[PDB]
C-alpha cells in the first residue's frame, strides 16, 4: 500500500493489522521451543467479518485454515490410521522444517500439477490459504486479509 495522492486506497482495518500482528507472534513460537499448539485457551487470532469492523464474540483456538488442515489433509492413512496426535503432527513437520521439498504429484491442489503460482496468494487465499506452506515455516511477512466464520 503505497500510492500517489487522489487515489481511493483500501488501507486495512485496525482489526486485520492487529490480526497479522498477532499471527506473526504465534507462528514464531513454533521455532522457539518447538513445544506449542495447546489449542485449549491459546493462539488468539482476531475475528472481523466483512467491512473490517470488530465482530462481537471474539474467540480463540485455531484459525479457520488450521483445523481444516489438521483434519482433512492429515487424514487418509496419515493420521486416521496411526497417529491423530496433535503433538506429533506439530513435529512431523519437524522433518519438513529442515529440508522439506518432496517431489510428489498429489497435494492439496486439484491433482497438484507437478517455478509456478507466483501470485496465487490472493484469489486462492480467499478459498483455502501452495507456495505459502514453506512461507509459514520460513520467516514470512503477511497472510491474506480475510476472516470468515467457522466454529467448534
UniProtKB/Swiss-Prot annotation:
Q: Give the positions annotated as glycosylation sites.
A: 33, 101
Q: Which residues carry this modification: Iodotyrosine?
A: 70
Q: Any domain commentary?
A: The cholinesterase-like (ChEL) region is required for dimerization and export from the endoplasmic reticulum.
The disease tied to this protein in UniProt is: Thyroid dyshormonogenesis 3: A disorder due to thyroid dyshormonogenesis, causing large goiters of elastic and soft consistency in the majority of patients. Although the degree of thyroid dysfunction varies considerably among patients with defective thyroglobulin synthesis, patients usually have a relatively high serum free triiodothyronine (T3) concentration with disproportionately low free tetraiodothyronine (T4) level.
Q: How is it modified after translation?
A: Iodinated on tyrosine residues by TPO.
In-chain residues carrying the UniProt-annotated modification Diiodotyrosine: 142
Family membership, please give it.
Answer: Belongs to the type-B carboxylesterase/lipase family.
Q: How does it assemble?
A: Monomer. Homodimer (via ChEL region); occurs in the endoplasmic reticulum and is required for export to the Golgi apparatus. Homooligomer; disulfide-linked; stored in this form in the thyroid follicle lumen.
Indicate what this protein is called per its UniProt record. Thyroglobulin
Thyroglobulin type-1 domain sequence ranges: 12-152
Cystine residue pairs: 15-48
**Cellular localization per UniProt:** Secreted
Could you say which tissues express the protein in this record? Answer: Specifically expressed in the thyroid gland.
Q: Which gene encodes it?
A: TG
Biological function: Acts as a substrate for the production of iodinated thyroid hormones thyroxine (T4) and triiodothyronine (T3). The synthesis of T3 and T4 involves iodination of selected tyrosine residues of TG/thyroglobulin followed by their oxidative coupling in the thyroid follicle lumen. Following TG re-internalization and lysosomal-mediated proteolysis, T3 and T4 are released from the polypeptide backbone leading to their secretion into the bloodstream. One dimer produces 7 thyroid hormone molecules.
